[PDB]
Amino acid sequence: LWSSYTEIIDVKQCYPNTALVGVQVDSEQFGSQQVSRNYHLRGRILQVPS
Amino acid sequence: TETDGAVFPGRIMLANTCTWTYRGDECGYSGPAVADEYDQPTSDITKDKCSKCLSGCKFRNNVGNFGGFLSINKLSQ
Amino acid sequence: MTGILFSLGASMVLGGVAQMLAPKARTPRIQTTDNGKQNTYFSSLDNMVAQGNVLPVLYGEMRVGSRVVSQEISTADEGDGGQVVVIGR
Amino acid sequence: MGKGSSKGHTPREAKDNLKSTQLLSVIDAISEGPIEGPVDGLKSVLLNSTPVLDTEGNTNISGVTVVFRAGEQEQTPPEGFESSGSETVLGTEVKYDTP
Amino acid sequence: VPEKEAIVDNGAHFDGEQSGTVNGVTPPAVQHLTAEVTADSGEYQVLARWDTPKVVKGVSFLLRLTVTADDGSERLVSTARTTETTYRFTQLALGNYRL
Numbered sequence A: 001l002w003s004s005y006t007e008i009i010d011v012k013q014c015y016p017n018t019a020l021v022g023v024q025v026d027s028e029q030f031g032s033q034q035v036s037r038n039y040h041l042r043g044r045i046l047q048v049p050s
Numbered sequence B: 001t002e003t004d005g006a007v008f009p010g011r012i013m014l015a016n017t018c019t020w021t022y023r024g025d026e027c028g029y030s031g032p033a034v035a036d037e038y039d040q041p042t043s044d045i046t047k048d049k050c051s052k053c054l055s056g057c058k059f060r061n062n063v064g065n066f067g068g069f070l071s072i073n074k075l076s077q
Numbered sequence C: 001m002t003g004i005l006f007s008l009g010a011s012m013v014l015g016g017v018a019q020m021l022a023p024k025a026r027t028p029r030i031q032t033t034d035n036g037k038q039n040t041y042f043s044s045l046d047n048m049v050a051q052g053n054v055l056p057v058l059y060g061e062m063r064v065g066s067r068v069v070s071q072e073i074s075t076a077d078e079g080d081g082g083q084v085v086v087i088g089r
Numbered sequence D: 001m002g003k004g005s006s007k008g009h010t011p012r013e014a015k016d017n018l019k020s021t022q023l024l025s026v027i028d029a030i031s032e033g034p035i036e037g038p039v040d041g042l043k044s045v046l047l048n049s050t051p052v053l054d055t056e057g058n059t060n061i062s063g064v065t066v067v068f069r070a071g072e073q074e075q076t077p078p079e080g081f082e083s084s085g086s087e088t089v090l091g092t093e094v095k096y097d098t099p
Numbered sequence E: 001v002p003e004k005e006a007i008v009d010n011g012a013h014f015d016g017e018q019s020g021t022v023n024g025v026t027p028p029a030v031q032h033l034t035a036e037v038t039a040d041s042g043e044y045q046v047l048a049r050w051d052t053p054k055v056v057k058g059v060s061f062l063l064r065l066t067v068t069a070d071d072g073s074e075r076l077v078s079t080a081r082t083t084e085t086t087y088r089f090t091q092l093a094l095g096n097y098r099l
């Protein structure tokens, strides 16, 4: 059987000048509880002397 | 160098309003005059102003550089 | 072009000698909801709401929790991206 | 991986029965300016408090797909996220002779 | 300055809908609901399956089972709330049913 088909339009926003992370995870594993995302990052690229 | 009216982070995440300055470095738009500040079509360069709304940005086809973050108000609710 | 000139040493030292050489660091207010869990102004480990709040700035290596821009639940597609897909046993 | 943009994934275990699986799609706004990025790849991403990758290469959580965009003026929108879609219901049986 | 009243009253240009009821946060209907009556295990069982729709920020499910008597009255046999897309019913009676 062939049931239907969908034409999908993705996100078209670039989010300039912001550092963002997107996560897609199968949710049956964690059960009822919500997931709390924490990241271990470095931070701003500053301007230092030559 | 006085610090009376200044708050440091200074950039607000808004759901429907763009915080950039029009034709600035961050908006990155440079082209013919398109619309008014009330989303009315125009061609005179003197009275071309962005309304900071999503339609005002769509007039420029510059949706990519939109300052605000759409559909936050669904989550904040 | 007249007046009285005073000595500020006794007035300045009233707080402490240290405050004359360097300002004092700020401490967040105490809320009893935390059960004595103590907070600081330069760390945050949880995910906060977005609208009406500022975009944070990160200056050094640290564990971070970040404001949410989107969150949804849907049904996952069976295809894993390759040409071959096998459904079921 | 790269500094400007990155991608990673841990493979999902195959199912046995004919059952569907939910999927959680989250976007987080970490900081403002150009930041250097993760310290150790996927091991620096923590769900609840568990690293996605163990201290070694062994995986702790299977099925996670992470996209990292360091703050830049010119960057591409995150991949795999959708805004809207329209569907047309066919409901027509496929037979051998007529595709 | 009396001239500022007309400047204030003109307001601004707002984009969107005043009603804004096209898409709130009410979840849509579940996608594919099917009930299967199997005697493989030696008993009569009902296997209910559905597919999660696009729900914002978490979703859970509510199930009601109703016995449709011959008269036309519908009795309520049981109710359940679960977060798993599949549910099984056992030890049922002889009448018709609706989920």
Ligand code: SF4
Residues within 6 Å of the ligand: B018, B019, B020, B021, B022, B023, B027, B028, B029, B050, B051, B052, B053, B054, B056, B057, B058, B060, B062, B063, B065, B066, B067
């Ligand atoms: S709405 Fe679009 S065109 Fe107008 S200032 Fe913002 S980014 Fe620029």
